[PDB]
């Protein structure tokens, strides 16, 4: 496609970004939002409008093109651990508070809300008091789209069973789906700088902070982990990414073996 090839030229010429010739689908998904608000009806018109050079349109295009979205029910097993071990452990004891840190486009906090709902439907009113998921990231368009809870075909085409799609999403016209409002109501989105104090967050039974600490230095990530520990109720659990180990905090965190994977108990 000629318009798409011209867009590849733009990304290389302006920013040195090398876009593969196999990513027409990814370009359409990442620029859908921006083209809508800008009144641009085609990629070809976008390519014309971005020659220039004045204004902030070129920045907005590079902004949208360099935002990664997270995955639904990432790695599967942490949500099985949540429903099969952690939630039964906590019931043997009070409103549930879960922190989804650096929630990005919202797939994880909404996945948690669906997993909670699945547990509540197979386990009575055992969660007597209710559940609150606090999802945080930097303010901006990515956190704003998370709050909206709307997702396109690319985002929905992976990691979501047809059972969960029919049960938890509302179709919103061609190629868009929205998380059902009952599922969204469980989640509260907040703007938070992970480098700042967590005092306003209160206390959590669980913290999900997955594939985020890799973006910080060894000293900064240790401080974040130390301050995350301050937000956990005694015996609360911290979930990291599937390939993430917790380094140099043996007095604060105890590794707990799951089937499979691990979680960290706050000591």
């Amino acid at each position: 496609n000629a318009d798409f090839e011209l867009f590849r030229v733009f990304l290389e010429k302006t920013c040195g970004i090398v876009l593969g010739s196999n990513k027409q689908y990814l370009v359409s998904s990442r620029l859908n939002k921006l083209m809508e608000q800008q009144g641009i009806k085609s990629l070809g018109e976008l390519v014309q409008r971005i020659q220039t050079q004045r204004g902030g349109l070129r920045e907005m295009v590079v902004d949208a093109m360099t935002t990664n979205e997270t995955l639904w029910f990432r790695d599967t097993y942490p949500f099985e651990v949540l429903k099969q071990r952690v939630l039964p452990e906590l019931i043997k004891a009070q409103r549930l508070r879960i922190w989804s840190a650096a929630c990005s486009s919202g797939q994880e906090p909404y996945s948690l809300s669906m997993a909670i709902d699945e547990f509540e439907k197979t386990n009575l009113g055992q969660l007597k008091a209710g559940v609150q998921i606090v999802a945080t990231d930097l303010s901006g368009s990515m956190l704003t789209a998370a709050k909206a809870g709307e997702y396109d075909t690319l985002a929905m085409g992976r990691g979501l069973s047809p059972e969960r799609l029919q049960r938890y999403f509302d179709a919103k016209g061609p190629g868009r789906w929205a998380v059902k409002p009952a599922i969204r109501s469980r989640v509260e989105f907040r703007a938070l700088n992970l480098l700042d104090s967590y005092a306003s967050l209160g206390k959590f039974d669980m913290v999900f902070c997955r594939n985020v600490l890799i973006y910080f230095s060894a000293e900064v990530k240790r401080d974040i982990l130390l301050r995350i520990h301050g937000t956990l109720k005694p015996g609360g659990y911290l979930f990291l990414g599937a390939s993430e180990a917790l380094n140099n905090l043996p007095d604060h965190y105890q590794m707990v073996q799951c089937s499979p994977g691990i979680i960290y108990r706050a000591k």
Partner: protein
């Protein structure tokens, strides 16, 4: 030069890193990263041709890799400063995530992207 203004904010960072050129490969200690370059320690047996491009590989954890084509900007007293030249979309997306999280303000990231896209205006 001391009158020039730095375009991009530099972030202290220590991920496992390598530098490549042709068939050569050096493990290097990373010192800082930015949206448009890196600072590394000069390794042993540094016969890297400064007039030809290099490649940097930054290993973020176990399963995230930031890859960039780099040019040697300066070298002195055991340090090597590199400027980013070409970078694949996934690598710059991880780099943008790193920069925005360490700046703590999305608008500061937007201003960095504005300087990146207008660098060759």
């Amino acid at each position: 030069q001391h009158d020039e203004r730095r375009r991009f904010h530099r972030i202290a960072f220590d991920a496992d890193s390598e530098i490549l050129q042709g068939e050569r490969r050096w493990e290097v200690l990373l010192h800082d990263v930015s949206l448009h370059g890196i600072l590394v320690g000069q390794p042993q047996d540094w016969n890297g041709d400064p007039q030809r491009p290099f490649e940097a590989r930054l290993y973020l954890g176990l399963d995230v890799l930031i890859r960039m084509e780099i040019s040697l900007a300066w070298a002195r007293d055991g340090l090597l400063g590199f400027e980013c030249q070409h970078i694949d979309l996934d690598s710059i997306s991880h780099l943008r995530r790193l920069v925005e999280l360490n700046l703590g303000d999305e608008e500061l990231l937007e201003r960095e992207l504005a300087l990146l896209v207008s660098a060759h205006d």
